[PDB]
Design a protein around this ligand. Structure first.
Ligand SMILES: CO[C@H]1O[C@H](CO)[C@@H](O)[C@H](O)[C@@H]1O
Ligand SMILES: CO[C@H]1O[C@H](CO)[C@@H](O)[C@H](O)[C@@H]1O
Ligand SMILES: CO[C@H]1O[C@H](CO)[C@@H](O)[C@H](O)[C@@H]1O
Ligand SMILES: CO[C@H]1O[C@H](CO)[C@@H](O)[C@H](O)[C@@H]1O
Lengths: 143, 143
């Protein structure tokens, strides 16, 4: 995959997956006022299915899961980076799939970021930073 | 390549290349107060070298060319989208290469965008919108 990002603040602890993802199977976002945590399931470059492990971020918010397949894949993610308390974090995220559904996580504000993937490309997974919340998010993308 | 973006306003006319780029050979940005135009040279998916054609945007600004090769490639582009007159355009662009040189085009402000490419990935080319100026910029990226 291509690896781009992340978007967000410098706090929390680094997060990534080994091996790198080639296809995302599911993703789970934990959120409330802002984005608390993220987790996902993927097929790696080893052609095996993996978990990203325990979620990246705290125990706050509520979980929501998106299940992906050959015709239902993530084509756009956008969001905002702003304060929640003293830290710059991911204060909102919006996920758009190839079947035209939008999910929105968080209700926060700040500086917008947007990654529209065109021509059949798709988000294959995530990396970033997280502590109590999701400080920063980055993407693995396949054409 | 992966195709992502664009970042900018809805004005000007659509711009793209056929065939799609797999490797960027050079890029030329025209700029003054803001970004006036962009052009580049690339190797296509047809494994031939191509021009992007006449520049995308107006006759304003001054040209600056970056020449790329196997060890000197674009690893990050950032910029801002803001007003110049009545239109939202690309008011600044910053290009960073694998040899650690930064070029900055434009002196404008507005909403920032940033695409850091990690792990040896690189910008392979551009698409977007342009009229008198560079209304919007998007990127082709290879891992
Ligand atoms: C403000 O409190 C709410 O938002 C935070 C941040 O999203 C969550 O951790 C918490 O559980 C609540 O839902
Ligand atoms: C509450 O502090 C923790 O959480 C914030 C937000 O995630 C991080 O910035 C910080 O480094 C800690 O990990
Ligand atoms: C404000 O005028 C300057 O900036 C504009 C926009 O970049 C250019 O077109 C022009 O030639 C000048 O350099
Ligand atoms: C001056 O008007 C032209 O240039 C601006 C800026 O590029 C475009 O938005 C617009 O559509 C026209 O093409």
């Amino acid at each position: 995959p291509v690896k781009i990002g992340p978007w967000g603040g410098n706090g929390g602890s680094e997060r990534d997956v080994q091996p790198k993802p080639i296809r995302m199977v599911s993703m789970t976002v934990s959120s409330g006022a802002i984005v608390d945590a993220i987790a996902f399931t993927y097929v790696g470059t080893d052609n095996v299915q993996h978990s990203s492990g325990i979620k990246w971020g705290g125990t706050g918010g509520t979980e929501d899961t998106i299940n992906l397949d050959a015709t239902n894949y993530v084509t756009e993610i956008s969001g905002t980076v702003g304060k929640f308390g003293t830290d710059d974090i991911v204060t909102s995220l919006k996920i758009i799939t190839s079947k035209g559904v939008t999910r929105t996580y968080g209700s926060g504000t700040g500086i917008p970021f947007r990654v529209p993937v065109l021509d059949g490309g798709k988000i294959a997974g995530f990396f970033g930073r997280a502590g109590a919340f999701l400080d920063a998010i980055g993407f693995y993308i396949t054409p």
